[PDB]
């Protein structure tokens with residue numbers, strides 16, 4: 001059966017691990033845990049296709065990771081995650097997209113822009129801003145909450161559907 005290699009990237013603390021664990025185990029990690037497994041596997045049915053999600057949960061570029069570039073090279077699709085209550089994390093997205101462009105040696109990489117923590121009231125990044133950034137990359141924008149599950153399945157399933165177009 002088909003395997004989709006997904007890589008989750010973005011700034012420290014935007015909720016890369018919380019999103020991936022909410023998808024894989026239907027649990028919200030409500031604390032900072034500095035030692036979470038990077039590799040997740042799940043057999044799922046997406047649009048009538050039985051397939052394997054192979055998910056690599058990376059560290060932010062500010063954190064030193066020796067396995068990051070190995071994870072980068074093998075990725076078929078990328079979730080580029082910022083938090084809607086973290087302007088710096090949104091600004092940082094360009095650097096993650098440039099790194100992806102560098103490693104895939106293409107500007108036509110399957111990607112989804114994810115605005116996480118959409119449950120939180122302290123919004124500093126407007127939907128419109130993120131839509132505009134995603135448009136400039138030729139990719140969809142999806143808002144998620146790792147806490148409430150809003151958009152989580154949609155973010156990962158949309159990325160699979162983007163890989164299928166490539």
Ligand SMILES: Nc1nc2c(ncn2[C@@H]2O[C@H](COP(=O)(O)OP(=O)(O)NP(=O)(O)O)[C@@H](O)[C@H]2O)c(=O)[nH]1
Nearest residue numbers: 012013014015016017018029030031117145146147
């Ligand atoms: N309210 C709310 N909190 C969230 C959401 N997603 C993550 N968090 C919280 O934000 C903090 C950081 O989450 P975490 O998943 O570890 O972020 P990360 O991007 O993997 N950090 P790192 O790059 O260091 O691995 C945690 O306390 C987590 O509970 C969300 O959607 N809503």
Ligand SMILES: [Ca+2]
Nearest residue numbers: 028029030031
């Ligand atoms: Ca807990």
Ligand SMILES: [Ca+2]
Nearest residue numbers: 033034035036
């Ligand atoms: Ca741990």
Ligand SMILES: [Ca+2]
Nearest residue numbers: 102103104105
């Ligand atoms: Ca290159």
Ligand SMILES: [Mg+2]
Nearest residue numbers: 016017036058
């Ligand atoms: Mg993490």
Ligand SMILES: [Mg+2]
Nearest residue numbers: 087124125126
């Ligand atoms: Mg503003």
